[PDB]
Design an enzyme around this catalytic site. Sequence first.
Site, PDB file in Angstrom:
ATOM      1  N   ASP A   1       0.936  -1.028   0.028  1.00  6.03           N
ATOM      2  CA  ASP A   1      -0.033  -0.022  -0.022  1.00  6.03           C
ATOM      3  C   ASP A   1       0.661   1.356  -0.015  1.00  6.03           C
ATOM      4  O   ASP A   1       1.192   1.644   1.070  1.00  6.03           O
ATOM      5  CB  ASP A   1      -0.798  -0.009   1.077  1.00  6.03           C
ATOM      6  CG  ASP A   1      -2.008   0.937   1.264  1.00  6.03           C
ATOM      7  OD1 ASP A   1      -1.877   1.689   0.231  1.00  6.03           O
ATOM      8  OD2 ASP A   1      -2.744   0.766   1.942  1.00  6.03           O
ATOM      9  N   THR A   2       0.879   1.898  -1.223  1.00  2.00           N
ATOM     10  CA  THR A   2       1.820   3.107  -1.337  1.00  2.00           C
ATOM     11  C   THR A   2       1.215   4.401  -0.557  1.00  2.00           C
ATOM     12  O   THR A   2       2.003   5.328  -0.206  1.00  2.00           O
ATOM     13  CB  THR A   2       2.283   3.296  -2.716  1.00  2.00           C
ATOM     14  OG1 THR A   2       0.950   3.631  -3.489  1.00  2.00           O
ATOM     15  CG2 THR A   2       2.986   2.279  -3.213  1.00  2.00           C
ATOM     16  N   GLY A   3      -0.454   4.131  -0.391  1.00  3.57           N
ATOM     17  CA  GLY A   3      -0.592   5.277   0.370  1.00  3.57           C
ATOM     18  C   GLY A   3      -0.705   5.137   1.891  1.00  3.57           C
ATOM     19  O   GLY A   3      -1.463   6.170   2.546  1.00  3.57           O
TER      20      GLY A   3
HETATM   21  C1  LIG Z   1     -13.064   1.485  -2.577  1.00  5.16           C
HETATM   22  O1  LIG Z   1     -12.263   2.449  -2.648  1.00  5.16           O
HETATM   23  C2  LIG Z   1     -11.758   2.901  -1.639  1.00  5.16           C
HETATM   24  C3  LIG Z   1     -10.628   3.746  -1.776  1.00  5.16           C
HETATM   25  C4  LIG Z   1      -9.791   4.099  -0.877  1.00  5.16           C
HETATM   26  C5  LIG Z   1      -9.957   3.548   0.286  1.00  5.16           C
HETATM   27  S1  LIG Z   1      -8.799   3.954   1.922  1.00  5.16           S
HETATM   28  O2  LIG Z   1      -8.577   5.272   1.630  1.00  5.16           O
HETATM   29  O3  LIG Z   1      -9.706   3.623   3.097  1.00  5.16           O
HETATM   30  N1  LIG Z   1      -7.408   2.993   1.892  1.00  5.16           N
HETATM   31  C6  LIG Z   1      -7.909   1.564   1.629  1.00  5.16           C
HETATM   32  C7  LIG Z   1      -6.948   0.532   2.611  1.00  5.16           C
HETATM   33  C8  LIG Z   1      -7.183  -0.778   2.385  1.00  5.16           C
HETATM   34  C9  LIG Z   1      -6.669   1.114   3.934  1.00  5.16           C
HETATM   35  C10 LIG Z   1      -6.508   3.337   1.132  1.00  5.16           C
HETATM   36  C11 LIG Z   1      -5.334   3.776   1.898  1.00  5.16           C
HETATM   37  O4  LIG Z   1      -4.116   3.714   1.096  1.00  5.16           O
HETATM   38  C12 LIG Z   1      -5.363   4.845   2.759  1.00  5.16           C
HETATM   39  C13 LIG Z   1      -5.224   6.177   2.011  1.00  5.16           C
HETATM   40  C14 LIG Z   1      -5.508   7.240   2.999  1.00  5.16           C
HETATM   41  C15 LIG Z   1      -4.465   8.168   3.559  1.00  5.16           C
HETATM   42  C16 LIG Z   1      -4.697   8.972   4.318  1.00  5.16           C
HETATM   43  C17 LIG Z   1      -5.760   9.353   5.010  1.00  5.16           C
HETATM   44  C18 LIG Z   1      -7.033   8.610   4.485  1.00  5.16           C
HETATM   45  C19 LIG Z   1      -6.748   7.426   3.607  1.00  5.16           C
HETATM   46  N2  LIG Z   1      -4.441   4.861   3.942  1.00  5.16           N
HETATM   47  C20 LIG Z   1      -4.552   4.980   5.032  1.00  5.16           C
HETATM   48  O5  LIG Z   1      -5.565   4.889   5.794  1.00  5.16           O
HETATM   49  O6  LIG Z   1      -3.139   5.060   5.828  1.00  5.16           O
HETATM   50  C21 LIG Z   1      -3.243   5.533   7.048  1.00  5.16           C
HETATM   51  C22 LIG Z   1      -2.684   4.839   8.235  1.00  5.16           C
HETATM   52  C23 LIG Z   1      -1.405   4.477   7.559  1.00  5.16           C
HETATM   53  O7  LIG Z   1      -0.525   5.215   8.024  1.00  5.16           O
HETATM   54  C24 LIG Z   1      -0.500   6.475   7.675  1.00  5.16           C
HETATM   55  O8  LIG Z   1      -0.303   6.684   6.316  1.00  5.16           O
HETATM   56  C25 LIG Z   1      -1.772   7.274   6.079  1.00  5.16           C
HETATM   57  C26 LIG Z   1      -2.920   7.095   7.218  1.00  5.16           C
HETATM   58  C27 LIG Z   1      -1.944   7.046   8.396  1.00  5.16           C
HETATM   59  C28 LIG Z   1      -2.488   5.876   9.212  1.00  5.16           C
HETATM   60  C29 LIG Z   1     -10.887   2.809   0.631  1.00  5.16           C
HETATM   61  C30 LIG Z   1     -11.948   2.279  -0.359  1.00  5.16           C
END
Ligand SMILES: COc1ccc(S(=O)(=O)N(CC(C)C)C[C@@H](O)[C@H](Cc2ccccc2)NC(=O)O[C@H]2[C@H]3CO[C@H]4OC[C@@H]2[C@H]4C3)cc1
Lengths: 99, 99
Positions: free
Chosen positions: B25-27
């Site tokens: 997960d690059t996000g």
């Molecule tokens: C169906 O279409 C979708 C599209 C997106 C999403 S999602 O956004 O819920 N997600 C899903 C993933 C399985 C958790 C993508 C992540 O890549 C999030 C993206 C995202 C970033 C920041 C804020 C909100 C969402 N990463 C993140 O939660 O990381 C936190 C945790 C990981 O460590 C840090 O990096 C970002 C934050 C923080 C704690 C859900 C449904």
Amino acid sequence: PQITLWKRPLVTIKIGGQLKEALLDTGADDTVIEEMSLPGRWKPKMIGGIGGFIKVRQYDQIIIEIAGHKAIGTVLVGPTPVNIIGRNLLTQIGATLNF
Amino acid sequence: PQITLWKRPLVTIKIGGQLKEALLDTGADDTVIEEMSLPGRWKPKMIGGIGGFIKVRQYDQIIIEIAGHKAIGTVLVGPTPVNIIGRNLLTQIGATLNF
Ligand SMILES: COc1ccc(S(=O)(=O)N(CC(C)C)C[C@@H](O)[C@H](Cc2ccccc2)NC(=O)O[C@H]2[C@H]3CO[C@H]4OC[C@@H]2[C@H]4C3)cc1
Ligand SMILES: [Cl-]
Ligand SMILES: [Cl-]
Ligand code: NA
């Protein structure tokens, strides 16, 4: 290009004629943008992540320019804390993960 | 390898001697895994995602195998809906985004 992951992979996008920053996110199935207007019809959808679910608007066939690459697909719009480019559009610009 | 994104980028990981599936997960800044036991002390952390914030347990210097690559680093444990490998460990296995 090749993007290392020492920092967040943020890029410039163009959507609805507006310039924004967004995170290239391989962990997101769908593309989710912070609240904004887009043309055309939409339908409500619920999407879940860490913390739970948010309600979003699903807009189909939206064109987005991602780091200068054009793509078209569904864009979800709602109270996400970050603009996310998800797999449905990353595939269209030929993005891969490599190790 | 080279991983395209037409499917979720799920890989097998090994942690605390158990195999699990996790998302590359690059996000995600950090690695977050569903509740399990890990050795050592932990520290508190609150993390925020699409649907709000959750409390997690932060364990440092945990050994984890990711798709056959050794990583040793911080793992967050809590009520995440999916196991996520974030940038802190993606950099340890040498991963880059390419297009
Ligand atoms: C169906 O279409 C979708 C599209 C997106 C999403 S999602 O956004 O819920 N997600 C899903 C993933 C399985 C958790 C993508 C992540 O890549 C999030 C993206 C995202 C970033 C920041 C804020 C909100 C969402 N990463 C993140 O939660 O990381 C936190 C945790 C990981 O460590 C840090 O990096 C970002 C934050 C923080 C704690 C859900 C449904
Ligand atoms: Cl799409
Ligand atoms: Cl392809
Ligand atoms: Na449309």
